[model samples]
Target: GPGSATTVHGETVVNGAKLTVTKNLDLVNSNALIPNTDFTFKIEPDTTVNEDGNKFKGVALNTPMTKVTYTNSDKGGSNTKTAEFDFSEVTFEKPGVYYYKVTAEKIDKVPGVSYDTTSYTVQVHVLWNEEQQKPVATYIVGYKEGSKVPIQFKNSLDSTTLTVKKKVSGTGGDRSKDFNFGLTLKANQYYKASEKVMIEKTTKGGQAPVQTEASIDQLYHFTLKDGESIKVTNLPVGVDYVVTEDDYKSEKYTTNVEVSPQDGAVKNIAGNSTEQETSTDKDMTITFTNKKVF
Candidate 1:
């Protein structure tokens, strides 16, 4: 055979065959890696072995192959793959330890014989630093549906929370009421705050706002209730926020919001204020009024 190496026992018989294999890989870290940042990881797979050398003598034995596997500590979802692997879609959900294992094997390509297998274990560590800060948005007012309030962070981080109360009708006829909250990232701002907006609503009056796709990146929808206020915590400090009402609609009520400004405030108020700026040293509040219109 063309690829078989000739090694005569006495003078005529020959036997060994051979080949070469190559594989290249790279793993990139794109995580914030805060002390307690919540996130998920995805693994991508590309396990292709390139073979060269002998062509006519028959395929070589002891070919190189690889396999990969992982286990998430939080969910305990164990995943595995062979030849090539992908973790590009895996999510960790929260901060914790992730166990990952990689196994490499070399087996016979032509004779089909078991050769050898090797395994490696790795621990993935994630953390948030002490310098990191997240601001909280607290709402204290009578709230309603079809109302929007936008917030912007000067330098965005991943820890901010948006808190809101569910809206209930003061009158007897109109029972269903809700509101949407908006958050925007101004120019040059890096990370985005929480996209999840929490609201406290109940019964016929406590209905979560219908989230529209119009400005999803800029807002989080919620339903507001009477006597129920929320405090959105964990936002990054020292960043300026420009908050406004982006979109809203109520079935039986008209809604309005008013804000009290500090020094660098952009939007001023007389009756209903549409915009406001956030400060690092102070806490802010806004009022929402729901009037029966339908």
Candidate 2:
């Protein structure tokens, strides 16, 4: 109230205000499934007429001065922000009835004043088939950390479990065991198949003779019926091993031993597809051929 001492708020101050928050769910669904693409929400918020000094005339329309909270039903998650609203790159992994809600709270730019927010529910409908023909079989090659090997897998199978064992025994301790398994797969539909192990032997008489960092021995590789396979070339250097294809592609998937290995497949690392760039102005198709058993 610089020139005019008029007040502004949601609803009529004193008796509380109405801060309605509504989103155009149809707009959000228009750009779903496209990763890294920004989605927008057409938010509409309004207030009521009850205030001190009738200050409602001081509300800024452009800079509505409110906070918004967003939640998604498919992810069982919620996020809130102070309203520079954009859902671009937002994940919609699961396909079904999508629901979201937003809450807008009136922000008081001037001191000693408070406004309320109204929450509104928004909905979007996404139609997808749960039993569509999956893409080609993804062959994941196993390598010794730095070796380059092309390993692939087959389809229509349960968890493709791979047992990893140490190839060297010199540091006077057990091998580095208890490993993790994953594939550089597309984010949607590719779930974890099984658990891989990593055997590590530390210093003697300390924490059960654990293994040192240099002793992270053993490389494991697993396959999925779908186009998903993992290569745990995270094995130590100077360790030799073999990776075979049992179910999917029946090709010999072998790689030499090297700690600082970099000769293996590029797509063996996890979460690669989720980060794949889509702005490339070209059409592309990915193919896989399995060649390892285990």
Candidate 3:
């Protein structure tokens, strides 16, 4: 009833023809949280005629032009979802050819979700019917997915990776020792932690770390040796996380933490901790340095 004149939630077919538009959410990486949000489309009619253009009277769309919102309830998945939108039959006042542009309007954008940036221009010709004795409409849309007049809006979401490395220096630095590392992830309201962690470069040669599903707002611990690194993959692109090194400080050893440039981070040696945002352009990196005091 409300907003129905300018918003459509589903497709409709009449006058022996069908017109439809769909929104596609394509997951670019595994563990990409499929955002739960509403989507809508905008339909605008062009009332100007060019040739007989002067003669054909372009009429305003009757009733509604659905910019209606539809909800997406999908859970975290690294896949694709097809959300469709269709409007009721458009009624014209007189015999005329009209052109309309349909667009996808992004509503309340959230982290880790991509929006489509394209629109469609289609023609609907109205002419006097010999039998019906009234002006009838003929809707013109693409025959398939990638037709000349494509009626689809495509969006994408992805999961990125983060890496943390440990380095020990000075004369007494221990390359064989296991340094404790603490990690915590804080995802946005739109996402959940559904990825895993991978650790590399250990005291023992030839090994792969055990990967486990991560939980948001929870602390995790890992061990690394000199020049060793740990990697966590499939994390939501815009979430924030922290990695702190513990149990490596004393009168004999001093530690410092440096964050990498997922966007040019500063060195934090005294704090011994690094915090950063997950990104998709490049994998995030953190380096921890421990030095011998004597």
Best model per lDDT: 3
Candidate 1 backbone clash number: 43
lDDT of 3 at 123: 62
> For each candidate, what TM-score against the reference?
0.30, 0.19, 0.73
Better of 2 and 3 by lDDT: 3
In model 1, which runs have C-alpha deviations exceeding 4 angstroms? 1-175, 185-218, 242-252, 260-273
Q: Give candidate 2's whole-model lDDT.
A: 0.25
Pitting candidate 1 against candidate 2, the one with the higher TM-score is 1
- Point out where model 3 deviates above 4 Å: 1-18, 47-89, 106-108, 112-114, 125-138, 142-149, 193-204, 262-266, 275-281
Best by TM-score: 3
Instruction: Summarize candidate 3's per-residue lDDT along 66-129 as a digit string, tens digits.
Output: 4323222354432333433232255666766566566777767655667887867656666777
Give the range of the ten consecutive residues with the poorest summed lDDT in model 3: 63-72
What's the lDDT for residue 16 in model 3?
24
lDDT of 1 by residue, 152-253 (tens): 001112333333333334454244434444444332122234322223323334566343321213543334444444444433333344444323343455
Mind giving the per-residue lDDT tens digits that candidate 2 earns over 1-294? 558687766664321112232222111222111111112223332234233322121122243333333232212222212234332223334433333333333332211112223343332232343465322111111222355332111111111111222232223322332222222221211111121223233232334532222111233333233223232222211122333323211223322212221332233322111123221111122222222333
